[PDB]
Amino acid sequence: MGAVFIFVGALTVLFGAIAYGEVTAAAATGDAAAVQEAAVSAILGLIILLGINLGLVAATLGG
Amino acid sequence: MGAVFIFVGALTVLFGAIAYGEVTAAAATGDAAAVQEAAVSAILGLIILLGINLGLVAATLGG
Amino acid sequence: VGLTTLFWLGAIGMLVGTLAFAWAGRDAGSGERRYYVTLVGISGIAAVAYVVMALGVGWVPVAERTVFAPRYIDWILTTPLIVYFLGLLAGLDSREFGIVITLNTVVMLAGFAGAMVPGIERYALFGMGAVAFLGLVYYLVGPMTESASQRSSGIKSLYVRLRNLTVILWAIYPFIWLLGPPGVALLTPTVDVALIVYLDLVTKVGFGFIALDAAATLRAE
Amino acid sequence: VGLTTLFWLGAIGMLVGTLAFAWAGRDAGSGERRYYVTLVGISGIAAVAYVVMALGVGWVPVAERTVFAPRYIDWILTTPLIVYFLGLLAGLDSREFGIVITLNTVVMLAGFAGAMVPGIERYALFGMGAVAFLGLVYYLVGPMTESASQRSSGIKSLYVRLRNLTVILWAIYPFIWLLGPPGVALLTPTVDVALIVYLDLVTKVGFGFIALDAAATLRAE
Ligand SMILES: *C/C=C(C)/C=C/C=C(C)/C=C/C1=C(C)CCCC1(C)C
Ligand SMILES: *C/C=C(C)/C=C/C=C(C)/C=C/C1=C(C)CCCC1(C)C
Ligand SMILES: CCCCCCCCO[C@@H]1O[C@H](CO)[C@@H](O)[C@H](O)[C@H]1O
Ligand SMILES: CCCCCCCCO[C@@H]1O[C@H](CO)[C@@H](O)[C@H](O)[C@H]1O
């Protein structure tokens, strides 16, 4: 389970970094609507990511 | 495990809704930097939320 | 969603737990009574603290942020009750109880003090709390686990499950302190409060429900 | 991070899996060979598809979005291999294999076709895929599970674990289709690609590693 968890924990921060980069890039623009757009994507993406990680975990540490 | 998962799945969308509301509220402002601020909080918050959910799941469906 | 709305959600969640723990305990003999009473104290105190914050009391301005005194006061009162519940399962003696409650209290006192300090030296107080927390974790997974392993199967199993919930989840709180208003304020006040409501609900009410579920099973075999 | 960088990460992840599956299989007798070969095909095909996208090929403009033909072509080729692997574990006969591969192929064909359709009628194609997917899930958790339950303990256990991984995770793909560029485009192209890389890696390489870990254990007792 260990290798599974740090895989999950590490990919989450890596996904968060990608999402953050998208938000900062949109921020550099000065367009508020662009940032909202990148942010809505990041939020939906992170929610889906939970589903994936939870799915992976439930599937491997379940029976 | 079922009641645990839909508790986790439902609180995640509820947290995502709070985060989204914060981003839209900042968006209504027209300030790009404000939106980035709300978005960075949402991203960090969602990452922490994964940790909580994963922690809860690992702790209850583990041994 | 406003802060007061989140605080009200916290209060209601804690009340629901408190009612559940009280009623579950109505079916309890001399040996189990203290556990149910402990759970009632834990969620009851938290319920009142949340009401206090929802009613707009204890919001303390600190420099350019807002710290919630009742949050930290709740923790000072309820976390030693959680440690007590765990110690009962583990089969600790008074001297062992004294050590872990002391370590626990240092964490909560340090964290509260640090939140109330405007200057950079608040991180020294955080640091003192963080070291004490590592000591508490050691006690939970080491000595206390060894003590628990001498008890019945059902008791050892509940201890490990609640120990795991506690160690993993309590470890998240200092990151919320660091990233939230008391630290570098990257989490908004709203996200900070929302995370703490959820986390408090799991560490108190989730903890209790896990215990309720195990207690029913042990008594039914 | 650019799209091509993500595609390269996908290709490397798939290559690492492919090398692992090939080498693990070097230790394999007549009974286990086909499973290892199947895993190599699954991750190998995916590795090449990712290279194709990383090299900037197959990026198809559709209205105001970009659809990746090699993504859908990969799925058309590799998902029936995953269904095949599961069917082997379950102990299916040719007629049973034919049903599930057919249902699987309808999902992937419908999803690819829908992604390539500019108009609102692409959701009808999605819908056709979604219904076929519910049929596939039924087959996986019903008939195929019943077939698997007649085999050895070690085999039934691997089947259920891989079945659970597959059903839960494959169910996420249509939501990414709906929320991403092919649907309402709420996910950016980058987030869309990043989610699919991770998901593909778990459903192919994670799947394979779970199988590798079980195979070693069965052979070592
Ligand atoms: C019901 C409330 C619970 C279980 C609260 C738990 C809070 C903690 C474990 C806090 C720990 C902290 C540190 C380890 C460092 C200093 C900051 C604290 C107080 C947030
Ligand atoms: C290695 C790649 C894998 C396992 C791909 C799996 C993809 C699916 C399960 C896609 C399913 C879809 C639906 C159920 C509806 C139509 C849209 C699809 C094709 C994305
Ligand atoms: C919320 C309910 C938690 C119940 C956990 C019970 C754990 C302690 O177990 C109790 O200890 C008694 C001795 O003190 C004995 O009668 C029995 O071992 C048992 O009833
Ligand atoms: C990646 C490795 C997966 C190996 C899974 C093996 C599952 C099938 O099991 C194999 O089937 C053979 C009959 O066909 C028999 O020799 C044995 O039951 C076994 O070796």
Residue numbers in the entry:
A (entry chain B), B (entry chain B): 22 to 84
C (entry chain A), D (entry chain A): 2 to 222
From the article:
The photoreceptor sensory rhodopsin II from N. pharaonis (NpSRII) in complex with its cognate transducer NpHtrII serves as a model system for studying transmembrane signal transfer. This complex displays a 2:2 stoichiometry where two transducers are flanked by two receptors.
Here, we report on new crystal structures of the ground and active M-state of NpSRII/NpHtrII1–157 complexes, in the space group I212121. Interestingly, the orientation of symmetrical parts of the dimer of two proteins is “U”-shaped contrary to the “V”-shaped quaternary structure reported previously (space group P21212). It is evident from Fig. 4 that the two receptors are oriented nearly parallel to the transducer and form a “U”-shaped binding crevice in the new crystal form I212121 compared to the “V”-shaped structure in the original P21212 symmetry. The angle between the G helices of NpSRII in the “U”-shape and the “V”-shape is 11°. A single NpSRII monomer of the “U”-shape dimer can be superimposed with the corresponding monomer of the “V”-shape dimer by a rigid body rotation by an angle of 8.5°. When comparing wild type structures solved in the I212121 and previously solved in the P21212 space groups it is seen that the structure of NpSRII is nearly the same (with backbone RMS deviation of 0.22 Å for ordered regions) and is highly similar to the structure of NpSRII when crystallized alone (with backbone RMS deviation of 0.27 Å for ordered regions). Having two data sets from different space groups (I212121 and P21212), we checked whether different crystal contacts have a structural influence on the retinal-binding site. We found that only the “U”-shape structure allows a close interaction between NpSRII and the HAMP domain, allowing it to be compactly fitted into the “U”-shape topology.
